[PDB]
Design a binder for this molecule. Structure first.
Ligand code: CA
Ligand code: CA
Ligand code: CA
Ligand code: CA
Ligand code: CA
Ligand code: CA
Ligand code: CA
Ligand code: CA
Lengths: 105, 323
């Protein structure tokens, strides 16, 4: 099941982006990754700054890998506990990175 | 000083052109802030134009400059793309000159180290058909460079991985797992690992290609580098569906994985615990096979390891198994 709400995004946001409430606009924005327990849902359909309405998951069980966590979110447990007070549930993480660059001279 | 050198790249004087090209090559190796200075000076269209040069010395030098610019950030890799480098680079793949060929591969591999849009741009330019053909090359230097770019392409999204599969790269990569050359084997394992990191249809294609028998045999390797890559690939296959998890068990991976839980190598151990943890998250039939292999007592003991990474991976694996 997917819920809808007005969107107040400032940039492009793909599916699986964690959302939070903006107390000023009363609209949903992308979760900063700094406000503990402020995450209200997970974006279901890719949207941006022009999108009026956001389609998001307000309930469900999601893997840690599947969710597109923001850069500012550094703490693993704070990411797991971001959906506190909601019907959302999180699991476990992976290990390395694989984009190889070779600079010479 | 830099915009004078850019104008000098099209100058009729041969000493002026070569000296500017040499100076700009030296700047392009001095970090992203220096790479950006070259880009903002507008050297990119001139460098791309020189890839059509009848002078092999100039072609090589402009190609080397572009390759070092392509080692920069995604905004700098995109600037190389927007300058029309890709059609020229895909043509240099048909070159009988092994020096230009290796340099074109290195540049394409560096472009494929950017984002998904950057990797897609390499694909749209038709780089993949030439790369799959280079996998049959007797030239060990060219083979590795082709395997390296293929791997960086397969490091993108699911559609970028499917583009590698549809190009017919999987049968060659599997045949390359039987290679006595440790460098070619490592690179063939690295590409397969990136292919198995996608979705379930991509993981199935790897299984259909016959990668698992060689992958299981490579777990009895004394080479830590070959071992880590074979493990990482098996772990990524095991992160798929239950039927895919069953293909791993059917090949006889579990006795080798359980034996690897005895390792004092924290790198091999973390990957062995992760691979079993992925197998353990499947159905009842798969869970029973893991218990039958004797993993239960090992996973429980590894929960008392001093290192938090091993401790957490063992805890996660045991949790997924007993739930
Ligand atoms: Ca010539
Ligand atoms: Ca030749
Ligand atoms: Ca040879
Ligand atoms: Ca050898
Ligand atoms: Ca995966
Ligand atoms: Ca060894
Ligand atoms: Ca690895
Ligand atoms: Ca050790």
């Amino acid at each position: 099941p997917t819920a809808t709400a007005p969107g107040g995004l400032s940039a492009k946001a793909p599916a699986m982006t964690p959302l939070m409430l903006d107390t000023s606009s009363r609209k949903l924005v992308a979760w900063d990754g700094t406000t503990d327990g402020a995450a209200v849902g997970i974006l279901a359909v890719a949207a941006d700054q022009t999108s009026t309405t956001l389609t998001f998951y307000k309930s469900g069980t999601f893997r840690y890998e599947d969710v597109l966590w923001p850069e500012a979110a550094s703490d693993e447990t704070k990411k797991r506990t971001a959906f506190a007070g909601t019907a959302i549930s999180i699991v476990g993480s992976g290990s390395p990175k694989r984009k190889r660059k070779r600079k010479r001279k | 000083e830099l915009p004078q050198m850019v104008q000098q790249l099209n100058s009729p004087d041969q000493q002026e052109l070569q000296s500017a090209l040499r100076k700009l090559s030296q700047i392009a190796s001095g970090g992203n802030e220096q790479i950006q200075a070259v880009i903002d000076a507008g050297a990119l269209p001139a460098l791309v134009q020189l890839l059509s040069s009848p002078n092999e010395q100039i072609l090589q030098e402009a190609l080397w400059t572009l390759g070092n610019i392509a080692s920069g950030g995604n905004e700098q890799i995109q600037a190389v793309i927007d300058a029309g480098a890709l059609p020229a680079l895909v043509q240099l793949l048909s070159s009988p000159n092994e020096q230009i060929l290796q340099e074109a591969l290195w540049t394409l591999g560096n472009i494929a180290s950017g984002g998904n849009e950057q990797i897609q741009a390499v694909i749209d330019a038709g780089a993949l058909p030439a790369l799959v053909q280079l996998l049959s090359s007797p030239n060990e230097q060219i083979l590795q460079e082709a395997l390296w770019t293929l791997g960086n392409i397969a490091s993108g999204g699911n559609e970028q991985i499917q583009a590698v599969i549809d190009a017919g790269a999987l049968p060659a990569l599997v045949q390359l797992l039987s290679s006595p050359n440790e460098q070619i084997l490592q690179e063939a394992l690295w590409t397969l690992g990136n292919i198995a990191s996608g979705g379930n249809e991509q993981i199935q294609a790897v299984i259909d290609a016959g990668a698992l028998p060689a992958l299981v045999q490579l777990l009895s390797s004394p080479n830590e580098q070959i071992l880590q890559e074979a493990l990482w690939t098996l772990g990524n296959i095991a992160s798929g569906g239950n039927e895919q998890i069953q293909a791993v068990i059917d090949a006889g991976a579990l006795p080798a994985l359980v034996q690897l839980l005895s390792s004092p190598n924290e790198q091999i151990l973390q990957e062995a615990l992760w691979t079993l943890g992925n197998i353990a998250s499947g159905g009842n039939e798969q869970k029973q096979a893991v218990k039958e292999a004797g993993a239960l007592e090992k996973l429980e003991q590894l929960q008392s390891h001093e290192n938090e990474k091993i401790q957490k991976e063992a805890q996660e694996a045991l949790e997924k198994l007993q739930s």
